[PDB]
Amino acid sequence: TSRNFSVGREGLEYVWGNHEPVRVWAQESAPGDPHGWPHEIIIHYYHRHPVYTVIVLCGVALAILVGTASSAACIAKARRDCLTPYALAPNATVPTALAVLCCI
């Protein structure tokens, strides 16, 4: 027959019949490349440590999301501040730099 035994970094020890104990330790030989493209890096560090990897990826996602949201809110508030005085007044001879910057 055949028996599968998971071996961690701390290691494993097995005795088969009357033979002496045999000890084996697991490597960090995950499939991927820490110094390659991002997909390889995430594959490597997810196979090594799935929970920690998922945590850092979700943290990065939250960071980019809140950064984009804050930037959007700030540009919208700047548009409000620099436009509402002119929208309440006639003949808004606006230098188009502000609008062209903050319309998109």
Binding site: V15, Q27, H35, C74
Partner: protein, 439 residues
Amino acid sequence: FEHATTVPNVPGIPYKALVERAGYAPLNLEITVVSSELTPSTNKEYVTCRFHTVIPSPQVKCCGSLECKASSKADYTCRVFGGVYPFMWGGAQCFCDSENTQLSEAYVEFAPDCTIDHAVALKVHTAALKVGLRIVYGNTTAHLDTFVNGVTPGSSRDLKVIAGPISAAFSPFDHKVVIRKGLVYNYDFPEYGAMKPGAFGDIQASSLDATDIVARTDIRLLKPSVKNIHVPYTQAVSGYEMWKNNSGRPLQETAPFGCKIEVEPLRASNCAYGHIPISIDIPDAAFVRSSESPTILEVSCTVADCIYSADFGGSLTLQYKADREGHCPVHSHSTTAVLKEATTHVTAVGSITLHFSTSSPQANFIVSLCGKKTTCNAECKPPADHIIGEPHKVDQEFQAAVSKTSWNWLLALFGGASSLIVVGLIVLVCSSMLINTRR
């Protein structure tokens, strides 16, 4: 000069350090935990084995009267039966066939084969850890057995060392243990005097030869039925045999941290857990002044194909120019890299190769040669082999186990959000200032 460090309690893996005095050449200091012994203090509660149910020969007084007396035997049982009229070989052993009283008697003792086949019940206490250490400093090596408690010192003829306490206390033995032909079990045997039939410890004694044997086997005699002389009884099974059948695996195959349980005395050997804080009073004669050691005028490091594995994966080369021929001690100042060598011969000009084991994706660590440092920078690939037959000699860290490419990507992505928030705040502030100016 006294040097204090915190070694990892892992047998067979050298731990290296470089003790640096104010005005003496740096000295190597390498420590190995050759063996350890986590031994508790045990007291014998009792011994037990299969009981031999000895049945004294019955007696008959068959028109008198007999009363059951009390004895001091183990599980002594006595009864008085009436009309029996026993036959032996002639068909009659009695006169006054009625009122025929007979005394049934039975008790238990230790079986003749119990001097080998027996179990001993012990209660353990706080375990004391003792380590055999090999310490080499400079050129001198010393072996010493020291108690890991923080007070008791180890001494080798000029060298004093004090170790302990262990960072995290641990003991594989529960409060109550049983030993049986060198096999130890963490079984909750009954306390002495509280025998129960059909379970372990049903028969107890202070020793194999002890005459104060006490037992409770639920032996009960029965009234004889057939005419011929005999004594019938029924008794529970041997609790020792039942425990043997349901003993389960011993602690030799169940102790965590992979450590060998040995007997006479009870102990656990070569048992890796925690860290040992060790301070060594290095003798003054060991050190030599820096004026005698060969200072290296310059040196440059280049790392060869490196690999972060348990064994000595990577290799590097120091190209050096010095002023004299000597015996420089080499060290790695990073906690995530350990060299193979400790002292290397050095010439006026040349190059020397050093092997090393690292647990980080990149070799970005400092190497010291006769004190002077060099920043070895390189990248290490993942190991090819999945399993090895050797323990990892370097612990894994968090900030050092992430590759510098991944660090750069994460830093850029986080700095994007940081840049976005700061530009938002500054544009808001400048808009506020401008509207204030033009209000």
